[PDB]
């Protein structure tokens, strides 16, 4: 639901997570490469 301004391993996300595996939907996709995205991890 446009996530806020955020990034992978700037704050709750990790470094980068392949979609392939993805279990979430308002995940950010932000600082990762094209295919790879990150999930609130703690």
């Given at each position: 639901d446009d996530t806020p301004s955020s990034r992978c391993g700037?704050?709750?996300?990790?470094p980068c997570l392949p979609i392939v595996d993805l279990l979430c939907i308002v995940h950010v996709t932000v600082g990762?490469?094209?295919?790879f995205g990150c999930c609130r991890i703690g």
């Open positions: 700037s704050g709750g996300w990790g990762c490469s094209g295919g």
